């Protein structure tokens, strides 16, 4: 009546070295392809083995201190070295839309089954750091998961949100805080330090438009946000910007004050806002917000309401989530907000009470 890890030691005295499958096919990987056992075999050996060890995290001790000194097992040096070349090949080129349907799901199933097992192996699996002592293709893995924004290219975004991309902003938050404490984070930071400078500048000018027209930029925006929103549960996003951009996400606020004059965008451009505010008001401050609530309160039929439109519209943006944005820092902050009395502003205040009404009672 033992428990797993204690029972393992009596087995090694017998047949211990090499018990999951060691000959995993490799050489017939030409440009041949098919939904034949060209995608089921290699991905059945992979999801079976990346599991027999993922679940073996409780017996995870005598199996990395002993599956890394397992040079003769021929398993690990194929599980890894292939899947890193194998993983890279799938990401590059996949090669009848139904044959590519089953192609994109069984590969999205391999990547994350590796990736959160990359979470497990990077955090509590190593008490002796047995893989940070040995990685032979630790570079290919970088070139894809960071495409957490351009991921609608390797896997589908509408086809991915079910099952996977419900689990995926999970895998990312699990993987980003996994290296962050490790000595392998500062290695990836150099890599990640690539998506903000090439984006800060183009997204800025490419958003102001009358109608829809430019639509391929309307998604990378939500992507620049989608991947940023998963980055607030990690590290480093606090390092890339407080350089001289502490009050810059406030210019992103002026960017919101920008599209006020031009006819309105409809109920779908309406949805974007965290990037508009949830992304900016999670690294930037909340006082320069109040300083815009009441500070922007400073200011035949057509030019009449324009006096009353930076008087009408500013209030409208200020609503929805911006009122709940107060809740994150509002203890103590409102006695300052409520003391200033430009005009009765307490009107918008009950907007705070309303969303509290909603959650509780």
Swiss-Prot record:
For the region Interaction with C1D, what residue ranges are annotated? 276-299
Task: Give the region (Leucine-zipper) as residue ranges.
Answer: 276-299
* Annotated consequence of substituting residue 220 to M: In a lung squamous cell carcinoma sample; somatic mutation
| Signal peptide limits | none
Report the PTM annotation: Autophosphorylated at two clusters, the T2609 cluster and the S2056 cluster. Autophosphorylation induces a conformational change that leads to remodeling of the DNA-PK complex, requisite for efficient end processing and DNA repair. S-nitrosylated by GAPDH.
UniProt subcellular location: Nucleus; Nucleus, Nucleolus; Cytoplasm, Cytosol
Reading the lineage from the top rank, the first entry is: Eukaryota
The family this protein is said to belong to: Belongs to the PI3/PI4-kinase family.
> Which disease is this protein implicated in?
Immunodeficiency 26 with or without neurologic abnormalities: A form of severe combined immunodeficiency characterized by reduced or absent T and B cells, recurrent candidiasis, and lower respiratory tract infections. Some patients show dysmorphic features, severe growth failure, microcephaly, seizures, and impaired neurological functions.
Listed under subunit, the entry gives: DNA-PK is a heterotrimer of PRKDC and the Ku dimer (composed of XRCC6/Ku70 and XRCC5/Ku86). Formation of this complex may be promoted by interaction with ILF3. Component of the core long-range non-homologous end joining (NHEJ) complex (also named DNA-PK complex) composed of PRKDC, LIG4, XRCC4, XRCC6/Ku70, XRCC5/Ku86 and NHEJ1/XLF. Additional component of the NHEJ complex includes PAXX. Following autophosphorylation, PRKDC dissociates from DNA. Interacts with DNA-PKcs-interacting protein (KIP) with the region upstream the kinase domain.
Function, as annotated: Serine/threonine-protein kinase that acts as a molecular sensor for DNA damage. Involved in DNA non-homologous end joining (NHEJ) required for double-strand break (DSB) repair and V(D)J recombination. Must be bound to DNA to express its catalytic properties. Promotes processing of hairpin DNA structures in V(D)J recombination by activation of the hairpin endonuclease artemis (DCLRE1C). Recruited by XRCC5 and XRCC6 to DNA ends and is required to (1) protect and align broken ends of DNA, thereby preventing their degradation, (2) and sequester the DSB for repair by NHEJ.
Q: What is this protein called?
A: DNA-dependent protein kinase catalytic subunit
Write down the species: Homo sapiens (Human)
Taxonomy of origin reads: Eukaryota, Metazoa, Chordata, Craniata, Vertebrata
Q: Which residues of the full protein are shown?
A: 1213 to 1609 of 4128
């Amino acid at each position: 009546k033992e428990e797993g890890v204690s029972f393992l030691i009596n087995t090694f005295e017998g047949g211990g070295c090499g018990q999951p499958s060691g000959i995993l096919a490799q050489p017939t990987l030409l440009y041949l392809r098919g939904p034949f056992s060209l995608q089921a075999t290699l991905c059945w050996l992979d999801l079976l083995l990346a599991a027999l060890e993922c679940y073996n995290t409780f017996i995870g001790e005598r199996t990395v201190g002993a599956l890394q000194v397992l040079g003769t097992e021929a398993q690990s040096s194929l599980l890894k070295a292939v899947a890193f070349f194998l993983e890279s090949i799938a990401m590059h080129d996949i090669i009848s839309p139904q044959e590519g349907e089953r192609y994109n799901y069984s590969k999205c199933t391999v990547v994350v089954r590796i990736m959160e097992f990359t979470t497990t192996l990077l955090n509590t699996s190593p008490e002796g750091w047995k893989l940070l002592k040995k990685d032979l293709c630790n570079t290919h893995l970088m070139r894809v998961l960071v495409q957490t924004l351009c991921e609608p290219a390797s896997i589908g975004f509408n086809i991915g949100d079910v099952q996977v991309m419900a689990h995926l902003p999970d895998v990312c938050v699990n993987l980003m805080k996994a290296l962050k404490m490790s000595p392998y984070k500062d290695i990836l930071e150099t890599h990640l330090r690539e998506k903000i400078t090439a984006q800060s500048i183009e997204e800025l000018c490419a958003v102001n438009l009358y109608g829809p027209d430019a639509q391929v930029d309307r998604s990378r925006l939500a992507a620049v946000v989608s991947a940023c929103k998963q980055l607030h549960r990690a590290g480093l996003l606090h390092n890339i910007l407080p350089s001289q951009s502490t009050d810059l996400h406030h210019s992103v606020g002026t960017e919101l004050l920008s599209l006020v004059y031009k006819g309105i965008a409809p109920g779908d451009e309406r949805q974007c806002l965290p990037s508009l505010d949830l992304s900016c008001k999670q690294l930037a401050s909340g006082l320069l917000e109040l300083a815009f609530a009441f500070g922007g309160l400073c200011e035949g039929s057509v030019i009449h309401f324009s006096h009353g439109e930076y008087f009408y519209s500013l209030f409208s943006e200020t609503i929805n989530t911006e009122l709940l944005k107060n809740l994150d820092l509002a203890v103590l902050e409102l006695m300052q907000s409520s003391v200033d009395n430009t005009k009765m502003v307490s009107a918008v205040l009950n907007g705070m009470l309303d969303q509290s009404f909603r959650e509780r009672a």
